[model samples]
Target: QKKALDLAFYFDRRLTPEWRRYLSQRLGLNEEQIERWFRRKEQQIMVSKGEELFTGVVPILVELDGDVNGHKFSVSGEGEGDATYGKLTLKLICTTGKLPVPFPTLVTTLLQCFARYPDHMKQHDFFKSAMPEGYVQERTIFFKDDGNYKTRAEVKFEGDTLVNRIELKGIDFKEDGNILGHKLEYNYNSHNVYITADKQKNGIKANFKIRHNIEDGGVQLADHYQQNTPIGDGPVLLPDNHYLSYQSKLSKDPNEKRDHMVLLEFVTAAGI
Candidate 1:
């Protein structure tokens, strides 16, 4: 009878009294004793499972301190980090105002991969062999729903080249006072040998390059550093880890001397 009660304990941790009668029939035990046994067992299960279950809540606190021109500034913010539906979220509220005045609160929540793949980006490797030819990876820097404003970059591998698509929405370019339906999209394709991007409508052309090598031990046999730098000055050598380096130069149109440009470099493996 105890074995039957123990076995039934596995099926129902609580008192349903529905299957507990099976314990009574096997050895003709009283229902009161069965209920008592299960009540004790339920407490045990609660103690064990409660101890095992983990509540995933993490508190975050960060401080920002800076000093410039003999003046010092200090600020701090408190927040929480949580996971929702495989996406990581961080919500923070910071006090902002004059240094000596009462400050108001600035609250914002940052959600990763919520608008694109929904799954976190860290799971996908940059050069997975089995990924589709046009599989996309996205990284969002800023996004606001009520204003419909966002800035993000999406990358894909295609035809022996890495393509980066940059997007900006709800921005008033050229100060035309019309922000509705205003957007900008730039697609840049880069390979180890070459790099280029789509031009702006107002005749803005850019010169760019994708590099596979790095610089070490400048003018003489000075010292070698395993860091990446821009593609100008000094003799360069291959890096320890493979990476793609890019630089962009925009030439202004004769008629319009004012132009805005977006610069980005998508670094992955050296080559396919």
Candidate 2:
């Protein structure tokens, strides 16, 4: 503790090369370890100012593998809109697929084949794929009666892109219905969509991403993040699961767990 205190004292508001060099010797930590400490501290500061930063809630739980689809999953709406900052709501469930956000990416290099393949863009919004012309995206519910997941089927051409977040409510395995959400977005050079609904949701905050196994016709991948529905973040061993260093952290408690990520490789039925 005494040595750590002395090392901590070396910490400055800025971890510039000069300070890093100075601290490296004083704290007995090399460049990389020092970098991790800075990241740790920066996160600490961010968390302390969470109330002011206006950040949304994303699970501290990390799911570096598998699929978690049944679970009530959501995302962090950071750098999204001002309203999103400091709030945890369904908007965190929003995707780049939304309007205005446009399909920010479409073309990809053979890069992934050699680098990381499909997983390479697991977190990327862009890919060398496109949704079909009559792309029907219906999300049926199991509880609500006559729960229509069909919100807006793009039939016309007007806007560069359109999205509709539907509101959901009701009762059973097939109880509720579907809603649409929209965000204004763009990109141009060759093509596009423009069937708008609304960024507004009817009530439901549900979504998906499908991945099929090419080798196996019946085998496919799914998504699910949180342990259960309604709740999205964490209820871990540590009230605030704060750990540092990949080697040290996961080795301890294995806190973060998620499966709500997949790439939809659509084989367009009718291409343009």
Candidate 3:
């Protein structure tokens, strides 16, 4: 138990088959013993270092069978759906332990979409083991940074169906060039994108467009011109590949005194 707990804690409870195998063989322990031992980790305090574009705090729940209540925040989470890749859940811990506001109900789920789809509308209010059902609560969060930058997104994935859903309110791209540089540096807030991949809907679909909220600028990206050529048409890089056969020819049979014939065998080996 001590070894399992130590390894689980060390490996963040990854317990992947390879990890399981390594640990089992190294310690001369079998699968059942290993599974039994590291099932729980001794309780400890958690501290978080944060990141942007992602919620920094990764909550560590001390209790799995029940909810947690604390002075600043609380946590209540559960799992179901597929045994492998599955429906995800997100819940805000309120003092009343309330379910989030009922947004809507659609799709079949023992789970939710983001804070958006598969809203549960059943009356059991909760489910039991093999109990066969329950409601999905849509959870949403709004955040505003000190620079007056605002973002709205549903971090929780709420559903059992295999799907990819993302709510990107704004995206700022980085640039090595100047106005493009300023666009990123000045925090030019001008993009709103949302994309989803619902297994129920074949695979994925989109309803997204870039908003042109750029500052009054000197030039445009992907469209700068040389002294002779006019704007918008000088440059967009794509190899014609019409001359691809040339590379193969040179690679295989170049002049010994003039051209370089590097990786000839490799060149012909990797067919288009």
Candidate 4:
């Protein structure tokens, strides 16, 4: 029975529309085949508004503190947002630890990862032998008539070391196509590393920066920060009936003397 419950927990978390689509496209499996072979025994597909949705509800709990000692904290505003699309923000007060890292490090790491994927594919024989049956790799061929284009990358820092960066490449899909506008870019940076609490007010504050541009346009930039309570707690949902709460804290800077908190939360609910 415990094993059955564990399987049910994973199925509930993993059976989203995005996962189903990835399985179908990558594995060439039909809906009936997947339903029979992949669906968990405890879960049954229920059609809602002509689309299938899961029925179980999961729970999550979290807590935040002002200092490493777990004293002097506050909670404000119930966090609410969708996890599947767009941007979401959550705020907490009072907990210490899990400070934000420099944004430049993250951007550099991502660029390296993206650039290395081609070499990784070649080393793994992915293009020739590793692909699933009935699938073939496609290659692009360059021609003398192809139009010329440019690529650019930039990073901007705000607060104590928050960095926002963007990379763009212009491409001409057709040999005779006019260049027109080349490319566009946008990105954000988290400056939560410089957060600390005011001993009297018991609040934390920090700042962030955003830099971006479109074709032939000047780069636009902005920076802003806010102050909020120091400690709080909330719930989080995990696989099985297991649930957990997290204690979070704002980042503090010793050099510039600034405090910042991350805006985020975890939540769970049933479809029906």
Candidate 5:
């Protein structure tokens, strides 16, 4: 039982065929029995949340210092099962540029997404596993330096589903132009990345739109752009292949050069 429990923790409570075989070999059980054990344990955590009332200071989780495009930045965060319910808060400060970094609008949009994890959420897949089943929580964080510029970040967790959305208004753009407006949304846990939940939805989805004013040479362009351009203005489902393709492309395709590629590199190292 202890062996299986350790496997559950290391495997993110996911039961894969290999792990099932290992457990079966070690515990003298068939794969079906192993699966049953995992299911019962998973449900056990959810049921335990019913009586779990944690009220205290929101302890800090992560801290990091880094540089983006010669701009130094620092990040820190806090969270807790406080009186208001479990909540997470993070702040990013930089010597120059803006919240994400002094990069193009697209680059900034993509990099800021790293904030979604906040390091804390992945501690134990806290957004799903630690959360009480059926509980709902929403948090909105405003990202602004001083100007009228601002980025509205909204986070919502419902049962096993997690959605993060960011809306940028009149935000500063560092390269060639500024972002008139932008929007990004990410839906997690509802995906078959590391594991597939038995929830109604079993896939990750994302969508974004950017209305920008950028210049190429002396030419100016202003228009709205969506994630699935020409295909549709709808959210896109992300499967394992999505990460695999980018992993291969970024690693193999020399022509796929971009400064913001660092974001992909980092995420890949983090197992995406």
Candidate 6:
């Protein structure tokens, strides 16, 4: 007789009626509230939100001529389906011999690239200040600086090949730190191999956009009172600086160029 595949154990499991009743009664909530709470909680459990988008990519799988060394790897998975925001995950796997630095150090380096994309989209002004003394300039573009940028990406695969589609949505820039009159969008699709190669060195590039509304601007200070100071010269700078740079530079990298390339290639093939 042939052996069974053990597929029964892989089936999805839902909360049992008894457990549901127990939870409902223990929570001391009415039926409608319980239903709504569970609905939202279930969504939260199934769909990751507010987590750094590409947190799943690490310790990836790699297959190379049975040696597993002297090879590059990268794996990326992305999906979109009538949702407000798309998601992408990537991983890099490789052999220890070819790497000049520790794998953890290399991972730290790659993570820095992930930290930069959002700042690039926002174009923050103070980024220039972090540059060398001579590099800082009034017109330097950084996150939340100019106020006109956007980004988006998607993924698809077919029979040993992969495809990635990216889009830049829009950017808003207002002198008073208000986003106004900004709209833009574009799309591009590249072969999976190409994306994998790019990610090893620079990390995967994804896009996002944010729009400001009356509520985001802030509560009106006075219904009819006028201020003597110009809007540009007030306390807005302090809050904007803190909020925009809150997560800045939280990630870093420590890999050499050659090892990074090999790891990226391996990751890409694994995704396929």
Choose the strongest candidate by TM-score.
5
lDDT of 6 by residue, 70-143 (tens): 22323222222111112222333333334321232121122111222232222221211111111100111122
Backbone clashes in candidate 5 total: 1
Give me the displacement of residue 175 in model 5, in angstroms: 2.6
**lDDT score for residue 228 of model 1:** 15
* Per-residue C-alpha lDDT of model 5 across residues 1-272, encoded as one tens digit per residue: 35756565566665778877888887787889778777766555543342232223333232334332333444332222231222323222222334443323322222111212222223222233322221122112122221122333333333322333344444233332222222221111111113112132332222222222223322122222212111122121222322210111111125533222222212221233
Which portions of model 3 show Cα errors greater than 4 Å?
1-4, 42-272
Give the Cα-based TM-score of candidate 3 against the true structure. 0.19
Highest-scoring model, lDDT: 5
**TM-score of every model versus the real structure:** 0.23, 0.22, 0.19, 0.19, 0.29, 0.20
Show the lowest summed lDDT stretch of 10 residues, model 4.
108-117
RMSD of each: 23.3, 21.3, 26.0, 21.9, 16.9, 22.1
Clashes per candidate, residues 3 or more apart or on different chains: 0, 44, 6, 34, 1, 38
Q: Give one digit per residue, the lDDT tens place, for model 1 in 166-239.
A: 33332222232111122211222233311111122111111222121112311111011111121222111111
Better model by TM-score: candidate 4 vs candidate 6: 6
Residue 192 C-alpha lDDT in model 1: 34
Could you tell me the C-alpha RMSD of candidate 4 in Å?
21.9
Q: Residue 118: error of model 5 in Å?
A: 21
lDDT of 5: 0.31
Across 1-272, the per-residue lDDT of candidate 2 in tens digits comes to 33663355354556678877877887677977777777665544433332222223221111111111222222322111111221111112123222211121111100000111122211111110111111122233221222122122221111321122222221222212121111211211221111122113211122332222222233222221111011112110111111111000001113424321212111111111
Deviation (Å) of 75 in candidate 2: 25
TM-score of 5: 0.29
Q: Candidate 2, residue 50: CA error in Å?
A: 1.4
lDDT string, candidate 3, 1-272, tens digits: 34554755576665668877888888778977766565422111100110111122222111111111111222232222221121223221222343121101000111211111111211111111101121112221211110111111122222322222221111232223222233321122222223232223222222322121234643222211101111122111111111001111112223333221111100010111
Q: Name the better of 2 and 5 by lDDT.
A: 5
